[PDB]
A paper describes a structure:
The α1-acid glycoprotein (AGP) is an abundant blood plasma protein with important immunomodulatory functions coupled to endogenous and exogenous ligand-binding properties. Its affinity for many drug-like structures, however, means AGP can have a significant effect on the pharmokinetics and pharmacodynamics of numerous small molecule therapeutics. Human plasma lipocalins present as two variants known as AGP1 and AGP2 (or F1/F2/S and A forms, respectively). The AGP2 structure has an archetypal eight-stranded antiparallel β-barrel structure that is characteristic of AGP and lipocalin folds.
Numbering used by the authors: -1 to 171
Write the structure that this text describes.
């Protein structure tokens, strides 16, 4: 039977053209937690990350430009996401493998989450993003609410530190 636990702030919803408009623009990676060992190992080294979404509605794709600071250096990538409208997921090929994430929303309109491996209690997790590099306490509290649905302790959360970003001064020029 169905395996994804639904709770107040963890609700998959179909991606529409209104959804694609809402996620168009620049986003900042704020925090995440997973039961999946590989994702935990990767994201624990991330100091900062921001990225740009540019949807192509007719082709069911999103153009992605990523600016990630780790090891005190700026690293860049561009690629295309595939959009699964009815499933409410996006997918990409990265690191020689496919990734799929549920696009998830909270009550505050300027944040969003990616749900990873949500049908797998051994591996599930959430990553949290906002339209500014730092969120308010109440904004972050919604992410903690969603994490409670996956029964992951807040002590497992990894956070970016915007003071450590190296990409912003380099993105243009
Ligand atoms: C490939 N990225 C991985 C799979 C999934 O979630 C993670 C958490 C994973 O990164 C470990 N993840 C991040 C973690 C830390 C900072 C940024 C990201 C990020 C972005 C994206 C995606 C993504 C798009 C489609 C399917 C799965 C996805 N995942 C991510 C991202 C993205 O599109 N932009 C972000 O930089």
């Amino acid at each position: 039977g169905p395996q994804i636990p639904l709770c107040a702030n963890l609700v998959p919803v179909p991606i529409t053209n209104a959804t694609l408009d809402r996620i168009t623009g620049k986003w900042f990676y704020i925090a995440s937690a997973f039961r999946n060992e590989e994702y935990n190992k990767s994201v624990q080294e991330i100091q900062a990350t921001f990225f740009y979404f540019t949807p192509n509605k007719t082709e069911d794709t999103i153009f992605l430009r990523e600016y990630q600071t780790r090891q005190n250096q700026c690293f860049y990538n561009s690629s295309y996401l595939n959009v699964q409208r009815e499933n409410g997921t996006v997918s990409r090929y990265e690191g020689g493998r496919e990734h799929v994430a549920h696009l998830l929303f909270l009550r505050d309109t300027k944040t969003l989450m990616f749900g990873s491996y949500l049908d797998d209690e051994k591996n599930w997790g959430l990553s949290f993003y906002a339209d500014k590099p730092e969120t308010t306490k109440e904004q972050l509290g919604e992410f903690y609410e969603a994490l409670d649905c996956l029964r992951i302790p807040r002590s497992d959360v990894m956070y970016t530190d915007w003071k450590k970003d190296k990409c912003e001064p380099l993105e243009k020029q």
